[PDB]
Amino acid sequence: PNVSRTIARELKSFLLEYTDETGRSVYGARIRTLGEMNSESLEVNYRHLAESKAILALFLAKCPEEMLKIFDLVAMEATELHYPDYARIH
C-alpha cells in the first residue's frame, strides 16, 4: 500500500541518527563498514528496532515479505547519502 511508503519516512530516521551507548550511531558505523568492505549486507539488530517501536517489530512477525523490499531500498538511500555512489556497486 502507499501508506507503507510513509513508514519508510520513519525507518530512515531509525537508520542513521539513532544512537546507543552514549552517542556514536551504530547503524551509521555499519553503513560505513559496508561501506569499505562493500560486502552488500547491511545488518539491523531486531533488539533496537523493537526498542524504538513495537509497531514495526509487529510488522516483522506479520508480513516481512514486502516490508524488507520497502526497507532495503531505503537502506540503499542511506548508503547513497553517506557514500554518493554504489550505483556501480550491487
Add this chain to the structure above:
Amino acid sequence: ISQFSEAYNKILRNSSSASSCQLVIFVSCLNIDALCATKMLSLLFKKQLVQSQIVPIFGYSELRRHYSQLDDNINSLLLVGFGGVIDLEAFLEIDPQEQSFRRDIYVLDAHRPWNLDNIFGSQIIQCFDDGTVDDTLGEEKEAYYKLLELNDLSKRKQRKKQIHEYEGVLEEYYSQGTTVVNSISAQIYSLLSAIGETNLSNLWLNILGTTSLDIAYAQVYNRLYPLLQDEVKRLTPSSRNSVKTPDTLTLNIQPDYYLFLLRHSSLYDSFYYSNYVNAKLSLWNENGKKRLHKMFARMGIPLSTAQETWLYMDHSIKRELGIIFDKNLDRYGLQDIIRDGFVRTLGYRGSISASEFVEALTALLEVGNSAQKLTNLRKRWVSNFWLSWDALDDRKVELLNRGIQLAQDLQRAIFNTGVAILEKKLIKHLRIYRLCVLQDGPDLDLYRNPLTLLRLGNTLIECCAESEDKQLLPMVLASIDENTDTYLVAGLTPRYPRGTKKPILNNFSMAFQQITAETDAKVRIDNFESSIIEIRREDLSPFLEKLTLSGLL
C-alpha cells in the same frame, strides 16, 4: 666558467684524429641523472661519429684505479657527477704537463658547493660550474686573489689578522651540505640547443633527467616546468590525431600522479605501495588500511576492479580518472597528487609515465643483474649498469618490462620490511636528530645497493613525517648481511609536505668527515656520495656516540 658551445668546440678540436680519438667520458655513478645525461651526450658524439670510451664507475676510490692505470693517447677527458665536492687535482696529481695544457678534463656536476681548488687555478678544468652557481659566490672569489700570494710588525699583524679574516668566511664555505642545484642533464640540453638539435628522444632524456630526482625534492624543478613545457611546445608530432598514428606517436602532457606505477600495475596496489600516500593515510597501520577502501567506497570503484591490472579496467573509469580524484582526494588531504606530468606513448605497446620509467631503471640497478668480495659485488653492479643502460633504448622494450616486474617486487619487499620497522617503533628520537638502525630483516641482498636504501630511507623519512609536528629531523639507516659486517649507513634529508621554504642542506657529509678526522673508526667514504659511508659493528656504536655529539646542527 665558460660558454657551453665554446667548451664544446674545444672538446671538438682536441678530439678527432688518427688514431681516434681519444676520450673517456666517465658516467658516474649510480644516479639516473648520469644515464640521462651521458646517453644524450653519447648520441651527440655518435652524430659526429667521434670515438669514445664510456666507463661505469661505482666507487670514488675506484676512479683512482682507472685514471692511474690506463691513460695513453687521451688528450681530452670528460667526467660526470664527480669532483664538485672533492678536487681531483690533489686526488690525481697532476703534476702539470706541458700553458695550453694537453689534456682537458671536463667535470660535470650538480653538486654544491664546488671544491675551492677546482674553479680557480685552471689545470684540469674547464669547469662546468656554469651557469647555476656563477654566482657570485664572491666568497670563493675573495678566497684566492686575497690568499694568493699574500712599523713592519703592525703591517705583519694587520696582514695576518686579514688572513684569518678571510679564512673564517672561507671556512664557512666548502663546509656545507651537498645539494643539487639543477640536473646535469638540463644543462647538457642547454648545451645541446645552442648546437641546434631538437631531437624528441633527446628531450625525453631531459624529461627523464629532471624527473630522476623528484623522489627527492625538486628543488628548483618546481620552476623547471617552464624550461621543459616550452620545449614540449617547440615541437609536436601532429596538430591533431590521426589515431594513433603508429609513428610519432610521441610524448605529451597528462594529469600524472606521484601515485606508484598506475599504468603498469593494479590500482589498489598502486595506492597501497605509493610513497606519498603511505604517509598521509597511515597504511602500515591496519586501522588506516581501511581508510583506503573508504577512498574506493567514495570513488565507487569496486574493490575487485581495483585489484585488476590497469590496462584492463573499464573505459568509464578511465574517462573519470581525472574527475573522481578531484571529487574525492581533496577530502583526505591527498589533494597534492595531481602534477602536470609528461607521458611518452609508444602506441600499440602502451604508454609510460615519465616517473614510472625512472622506477623501471632504478629497479634495474639493484636486481635482474675480504676486499675480493666487495670488489666482486661492486663489479656485479657495474655489469648491471649496462642492463639498465639498455632499457633506455627505444628499440628494445622487451627487457624494460623486466624492470617493471622488478620495480613492483622491490616495493613489495620495501613496503613489507618498512612496516616490519614501524610495528616495533624502532625510531630513536634522541635529542638533536632522529636516528634508526635495522639490526635484522628479510632479504638484505636487496638493501646492498646505496639506491635501495635511498628509496627505503625515502619512504621512511616520508612516512614518519606527514608532517606530523614537529621538527623535520634527518634519518639514519643501517643494514648487514655478508662481507663481514660492512653495515652500510646512508645519510638522509628531511621531507617537507609540499610547503618547501628552504633547501636545508644535508649535514651528514660534514659530520662524517669530522669523525674520519677524529678516531676514524672503520669509517669508509668509499661510496661516491658524501652522505653514505660504511662501518663495522665493532666500531659502529662508538661511531654512533660520536655522531650524537658534537652535533653540527
